[PDB]
Design a protein around this ligand. Structure first.
Ligand SMILES: [Zn+2]
Ligand SMILES: [Zn+2]
Ligand SMILES: [Zn+2]
Lengths: 1159, 45, 68
């Protein structure tokens, strides 16, 4: 593989107008933007507002023993649909051609990227009118390159026509101008009843036990909530669930009888109808039935009425309508929300209680919630839709409470037929929910009345620091489990238990405290987020040998088949396996039909559907075929081996398929799947480490977490970026050793480092403890040469507290202007020259007030001489405003200074130690001074043998002119990679082991031993941005007279009184920090009741201090107010730290005082 | 009077102090200042 | 940005060898060894004009003073 150079230049010069040259970056960001696309289209918000329901209001008449309290004027309102229009420009016509707002401007003008939100409010006047009205409800942010931005479908050339760079990615809502993003979280599986062995259950309900069954059921609008089954020691099962932040606990027999019109024989023969009279199950179900018979009633109507009369309070249900329908409202809204039909909720509840009882008796292993087998991902747009539906539901409840209060007062205005009344009430309440969503995005504190089944309520959004390309991608791929686990320090899920092979990367994960939590997805792991219709799955199952009954059509051997939380039939495990296999082959074959020419009807069975066959075995996972069709799962591709085409599979068939990892590993009759190429298991940033399978994997972990922090090219459109701190590399190149995916993923547009001619040698002596040198002339000819951009913003609208109109303005007041600095930098307008070099104490902008007319100034706080490259006069808003914002982008320069970390692509970070002169460096027979001397002692105990191979490959590829392929897992044990590159080199002419005969520079005669010179890829780091502070003397503290906030104490004191250095301790702590000579009353022994004498005589002698607490012409004295005293003569000087005087103060304010004696 | 650049249209605006800021020909609301003629030196290092 | 005049390790000036290297690959059907016709004997001056990202022909398409 060669460097695409001609193609690179012909994609740089004339950019493509057809379609983005790099499809894989877009398939990498596709989760978020396709989730938002699913939000707008595919009927997602519409389902949300339908399932909101309708809310009623009326005039309440007290029943007064009537029982049917009357109410005639009833209005029942609902939201019909939601529309999100494209982001126009301050919708109100500003007397211009109303044009769009491309996000470039939202980054420039430092304003969020919002768009109108239209709701379709609907009426009912307890008749049938249903007149409608569209309501603006504020403006919500909108994802860049989403379905509702003005960049969708645009080709790169039309993006260069705008101000965003050619290969834009999208996925991030622009909020105030800082690209916020919703991180992917990990949740339990949708609808699949999992088991739980968690000990916290035990002390929860003391009659309870640890064994439980949890299920996170989700509605069609992806608005899940949980409801678990507690198995209590007595024998019955409790149906725990959540509502309005509060747990709620009703016995499972209660809702089992309340759901369908059932008789108890049906419950029994459904739970345990099998193997008639199995001991454990039979007695437990008997005990349960009787324990419910204890207090309850018989029929379904009585149970529903009791349930309503119990739960009418907490449900937001209509106050007046009826009572049994409230029971139906529970059994519709809470019990099992994913299912629609009551009889089917009943069937799944029987199956679930059977699974619980099997788990209790040890016939079923405990599924593990901290493993990707039972985990899915929540995207961004789905969380956005949930929060938008929650805000809409709150808005409806709020206008409902406003109507109820309006009616309740006495009757100020009550006209449920008049539209004027509705205009009044809408005008009353807060109608702006755009700012709620914008606040969730600006902060992250998800402030909702119900948590939507989310453990943690903080930290949902990450700011997309474009510092370096890998950093941007790594933002887009990652996931996270939530700090609710980080606070628990355990050898738990932070472990890499292996149902992740190909889903989430093994190596790429930060080091330190968050290690193991945020696992970035693999390279190829997609996220299926557009579900499809599956009715042909029940049709085909019924055709294929399974049948769902009405009365118990179930026996011993028959296992269950489950369609994303709906029991569709029962079949023996042999037939279950046959059905699984034939479904898989039908899916694959019709997919290969659908991709090419043959017609694309709605797919019989979609690819994304996963056929999770769970074989039976004693003490295993509970066996039953599981058919999932939900969105927001993880799904990756493999090659089906009987056929020869794609097939997609998720983290539920992983654990039960023999996916042979090579064409050569496949063992016949068993291995039914092949991995495309094992490179498919790593992530995107981790895969780009040449020979990544030679290093000790901690080195690859450090290299991922450190290549996410290189001073590299953060893009190509930098002139149009309003970020605070950008870093750019002047001289970058493509690596000479590279993985093909470094070309596929379009990294060529964003280089990170240069190619250093590294000599492994211990010669200078400065390069121990991991440091290194940098050939001086190889530095002064332009080695890694950074430029930092610090853009700071000035806003006069802050210093306008309240009371006056706009006063401050940019410029100089009509009048005088100092020449000594202000006219040197600032042009005339108070805005600095473009290109004038600033220093620390230098003025940068100038504004004056109107009243005082005096020109104020703002100075450059940073301590390093920077230039000025671009100033933006931000128009405040839509129009009709003065320049009330400026944005100045200083271009600081940062060459390699002693202390700036360099680090190859193996975790080999160093520090530029001295910068040896180019004459005192060694040289080969050829004459190239090695650009960087690394130390040989750093490779043992580090195992970066990958670096030796990479240096070999670099010196080989640079010679002939190849782009040495370095994908993980190509080179086997038969012929080693080292031998391949050695053949390369010996063809070129150099030494085969890579050595090279060098002469030393400081002596001239050759080094006895040959030395190892290669061409490594050195990406300069940027951790040196916060380097130094020397304090001779300065300000002191207000209270304790201490140096204001270096720290010496509480461990430094240990060291000093360890050395036996009394005088050094008393110096550094008491002398140099805070020293004072305070007077002390010797007799009364206190330090505060002393006072200097006043007005003793003329200038004369010294003011001879006296004491007050010890008191009662020469000796007597007066006070400031004139009060005379006598006595209190014994006053002397003592030396005690000022902090002790402050302690005396705060102590006497408590009336407790120490009387320190003096001799 | 100063000479600026409308961000999008790239048109010399000639807007004066304490005035309504916007592009005279497009209506855009972002203005860069232009780099005038001024003498600076840098060592060739 | 533009080609790094005066390659780092050697002292050779290679600023001028980019528009005359590119139009050897472009139309001469010669491969990465085109630079051997350029006279780069070492491999320190040679990994400069070989693996060079010429990222300024992509960044010059953002003239804010485009007049359009
Ligand atoms: Zn006293
Ligand atoms: Zn314009
Ligand atoms: Zn050179």
């Amino acid at each position: 593989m060669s460097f695409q150079t001609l193609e690179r230049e012909r994609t740089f010069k004339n950019p493509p107008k057809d379609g983005t040259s790099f499809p894989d970056l877009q398939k990498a960001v596709k989760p978020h933007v396709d989730s938002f696309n699913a939000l707008t289209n595919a009927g997602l918000l519409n389902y949300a507002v339908k399932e909101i329901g309708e809310k009623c209001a009326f005039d309440s008449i007290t029943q007064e023993e009537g029982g049917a309290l009357k109410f005639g004027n009833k209005i029942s309102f609902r939201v019909d649909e939601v529309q999100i229009a494209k982001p126009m420009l301050s919708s109100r016509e500003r007397s211009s051609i109303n044009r769009k707002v491309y996000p470039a401007e939202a980054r420039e003008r430092l304003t969020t990227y919002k768009s109108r939100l239209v709701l379709k409010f609907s009426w009912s006047v307890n008749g049938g009118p249903r007149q409608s009205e569209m309501r603006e409800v504020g403006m919500i942010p909108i994802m860049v390159r989403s379905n509702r931005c003005h960049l969708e479908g645009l080709s790169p050339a039309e993006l260069i026509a705008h101000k965003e760079e050619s290969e834009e990615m999208g996925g991030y809502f622009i909020v105030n101008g800082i690209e916020k993003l919703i991180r992917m979280l990990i949740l339990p599986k949708r609808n699949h009843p999992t088991a739980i062995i968690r000990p916290s259950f035990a002390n929860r309900g003391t009659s309870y036990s640890q064994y439980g069954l949890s299920i996170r059921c989700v509605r069609p609008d992806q608005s899940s909530l949980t409801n678990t089954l507690h198995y209590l020691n007595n024998g019955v099962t409790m149906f725990r669930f959540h509502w309005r932040k509060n747990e709620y606990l009703i016995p499972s027999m209660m809702i089992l009888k309340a759901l369908l019109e059932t008789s108890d024989k049906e419950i029994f023969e459904g739970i345990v109808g099998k193997d008639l009279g199995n001991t454990f199950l039979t007695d437990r179900v008997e005990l349960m039935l009787r324990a419910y018979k204890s207090y309850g009633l018989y029929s379904q109507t009585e149970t529903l009425q009791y349930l309503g009369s119990k739960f009418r309070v907490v449900l937001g249900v209509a106050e007046d309508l009826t009572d049994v329908e409230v029971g139906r409202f529970l059994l519709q809204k809470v019990v099992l929300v994913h299912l629609r039909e009551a009889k089917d909720k009943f069937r799944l509840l029987l199956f679930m209680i059977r699974k619980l009882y099997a788990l209790v008796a040890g016939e079923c292993c405990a599924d593990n919630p901290d493993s990707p087998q039972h985990q899915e991902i929540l995207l961004g747009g789905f969380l956005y839709g949930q929060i938008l539906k929650e805000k809409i539901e709150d808005w409806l409840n709020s206008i409902r409470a406003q109507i109820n209060l309006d009616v309740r007062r006495s009757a100020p205005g009550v006209d449920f037929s008049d539209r004027k009344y509705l205009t009044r009430v809408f005008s009353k309440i807060n109608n702006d929910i755009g700012t709620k969503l914008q606040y969730f995005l600006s902060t992250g504190n998800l402030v909702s009345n119900t948590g939507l089944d989310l453990q943690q309520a903080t930290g949902y959004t990450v700011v997309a620091e474009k510092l370096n390309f890998y950093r941007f991608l790594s933002h887009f791929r990652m996931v996270h489990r939530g700090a609710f686990f980080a606070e628990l320090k355990t050898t738990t899920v932070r472990k890499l238990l292996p149902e992740a092979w190909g889903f989430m990367c093994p190596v790429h994960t930060p080091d330190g405290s968050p290690c193991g939590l945020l696992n970035h997805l693999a390279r190829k792991c997609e996220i299926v987020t557009h579900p499809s219709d599956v009715s042909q799955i029940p049709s085909l199952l019924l055709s294929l040998g399974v049948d769902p009954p009405s009365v118990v059509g179930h026996e011993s051997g028959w296992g269950c088949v489950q369609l994303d939380g709906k029991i569709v039939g029962w079949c023996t495990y042999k037939l279950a396996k046959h059905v699984a296999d034939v479904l898989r082959l039908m899916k694959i074959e019709y997919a290969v039909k659908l991709r090419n020419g043959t017609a694309t009807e709605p797919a019989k069975v979609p690819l994304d559907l996963e056929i999770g066959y769970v074989p039976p075995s004693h003490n295993g996972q509970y066996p039953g075929l599981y058919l999932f069709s939900n969105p927001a799962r993880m799904v990756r591709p493999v090659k089906h081996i009987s056929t020869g085409e794609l097939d997609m599979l998720g983290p539920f068939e992983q654990v039960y398929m023999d996916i042979a990892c090579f064409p050569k590993e496949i063992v016949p009759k068993v291995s039914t799947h092949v991995e495309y190429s094992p490179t498919n298991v790593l992530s995107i940033v981790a895969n780009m480490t040449p020979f990544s399978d030679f290093n000790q994997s901690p080195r690859n972990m450090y290299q991922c977490q450190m290549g996410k922090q290189t001073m590299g090219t953060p893009g190509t459109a930098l002139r149009y970026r309003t970020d605070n701190k950008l870093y750019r590399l002047q001289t970058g190149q493509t690596p000479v050793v590279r993985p093909k995916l470094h070309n596929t993923y379009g990294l060529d547009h964003y280089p990170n480092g240069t190619n250093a001619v590294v000599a492994v040698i211990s010669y200078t002596g400065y390069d121990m403890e991991d440091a290194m040198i940098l050939n001086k002339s190889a530095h002064e000819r332009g080695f890694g040469y950074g430029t930092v951009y610090k853009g700071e913003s000035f806003d006069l609208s802050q210093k306008r507290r309240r009371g006056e109109p706009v006063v401050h303005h940019f410029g100089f007041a009509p009048g005088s202007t100092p020449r000594r600095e202000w006219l040197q930098k600032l042009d005339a307008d108070g805005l600095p020259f473009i290109g004038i070099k600033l220093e620390d104490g230098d003025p940068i902008v100038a504004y004056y007030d109107e009243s005082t007319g005096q020109n104020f100034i703002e100075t450059y706080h940073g301590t390093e001489p920077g230039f000025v490259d671009e100033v933006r006069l931000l128009g405040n808003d839509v129009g009709d405003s003065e320049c009330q914002q400026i944005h100045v982008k200083l271009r600081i320069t940062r060459s390699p200074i002693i202390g700036d970390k360099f680090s190859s692509r193996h975790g080999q970070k160093g520090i530029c130690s001295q910068k040896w002169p180019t004459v005192d460096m060694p040289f080969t027979e050829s004459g190239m001074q090695p650009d960087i001397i690394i130390n040989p002692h750093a490779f043992p105990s580090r195992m970066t043998i990958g670096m030796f191979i990479e240096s070999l490959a670099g010196k080989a590829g640079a010679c002939h002119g190849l782009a040495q392929d370095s994908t993980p897992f190509i080179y086997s044990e038969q012929q080693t990679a080292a031998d391949y590159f050695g053949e390369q080199l010996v063809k070129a002419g150099y030494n085969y082991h890579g050595n090279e005969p060098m002469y030393s520079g400081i002596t001239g005669q050759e080094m006895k031993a040959d030395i190892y010179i290669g061409v490594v890829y050195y990406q300069r780091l940027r951790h040196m941005v916060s380097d130094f502070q020397v304090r001779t003397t300065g300000p002191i503290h207000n209270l304790t007279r201490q140096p204001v906030k270096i720290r010496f104490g509480e461990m430094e004191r240990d060291a000093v009184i360890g050395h036996g250095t009394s005088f050094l301790m008393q110096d550094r702590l008491m002398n140099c920090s805070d020293y004072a000579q305070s007077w002390v009353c010797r007799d009364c022994g206190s330090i505060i009741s002393i006072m200097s004498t006043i007005s003793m005589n003329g200038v004369g002698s010294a003011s001879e201090v006296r004491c007050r607490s010890c008191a009662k012409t020469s000796d007597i004295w007066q006070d400031g107010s004139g009060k005379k005293f006598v006595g209190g003569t014994n006053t002397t000087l003592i030396a005690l730290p000022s902090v002790f005087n402050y302690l005396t103060a705060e102590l006497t304010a408590m009336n407790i005082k120490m009387m320190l004696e003096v001799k | 009077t100063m000479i600026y650049l409308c961000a999008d249209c790239g048109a010399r605006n000639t807007i004066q102090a304490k005035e309504v800021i916007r592009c005279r020909e497009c209506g855009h609301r972002v203005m860069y200042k232009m780099r005038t003629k001024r003498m600076v030196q840098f060592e060739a290092r | 940005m533009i080609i790094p005049i005066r390659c780092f390790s050697c002292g050779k000036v290679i600023g001028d060898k980019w528009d005359t290297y590119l139009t050897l690959l472009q139309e001469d059907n010669t491969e990465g060894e085109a630079l051997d016709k350029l006279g780069l004997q070492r491999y320190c001056c040679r990994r400069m004009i070989l693996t060079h990202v010429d990222l300024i022909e992509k960044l010059l398409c953002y003239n804010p003073l485009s007049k359009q």
